[PDB]
Design a protein around this ligand. Structure first.
Ligand SMILES: [Cl-]
Ligand SMILES: [Cl-]
Length: 162
């Protein structure tokens, strides 16, 4: 298991424009297009993202290309963020993947808002971080995915994904 396999499990793959768990137009492997209610705004963001006239449909290679870019961007967002970088640097390789997963899902600013959890993660108080992580809109809205990520932080293993 690695971050790619992990997010592919959590996000799925769809080759036509769909709405994510929040109702936002999305494509591929959780690639958010726009938060706008307009399918035409989504189709336009998609053509721009892929560099061709797609009419709402992409190929698997195209979906994996956006995915690679998004994982890379999630890692870059962590390393650029004053609150996220020290936590990431403190973590082992498996728990780092858990942090990337959160940033991919909710963005750098959203995760940097988990001040208390991040501190507990940096201190390696795993059971406590896991309890605090769960007291979140994140956990209440997407409990199955959140539980898998939280388990990864708690155990430092891939057991929730195997
Ligand atoms: Cl893009
Ligand atoms: Cl879920």
């Amino acid at each position: 298991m690695n971050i790619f396999e992990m997010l592919r499990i959590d996000e799925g793959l769809r080759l036509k424009i769909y709405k994510d768990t929040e109702g936002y137009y999305t494509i591929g492997i959780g690639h958010l297009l726009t938060k706008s209610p307009s399918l035409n705004a989504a189709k336009s963001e998609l053509d721009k993202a892929i560099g061709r006239n797609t009419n709402g449909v992409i190929t698997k290679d195209e979906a994996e290309k956006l995915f690679n870019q998004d994982v890379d961007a999630a890692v870059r967002g962590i390393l650029r963020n004053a609150k996220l970088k020290p936590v990431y640097d403190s973590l082992d390789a498996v728990r780092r993947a858990a942090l990337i997963n959160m940033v991919f899902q909710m963005g750098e600013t959203g995760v940097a808002g988990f001040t208390n959890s991040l501190r507990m993660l940096q201190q390696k108080r795993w059971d406590e971080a896991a309890v605090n992580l769960a007291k979140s809109r994140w956990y209440n809205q997407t409990p199955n995915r959140a539980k898998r990520v939280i388990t990864t932080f708690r155990t430092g293993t891939w057991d929730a994904y195997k």
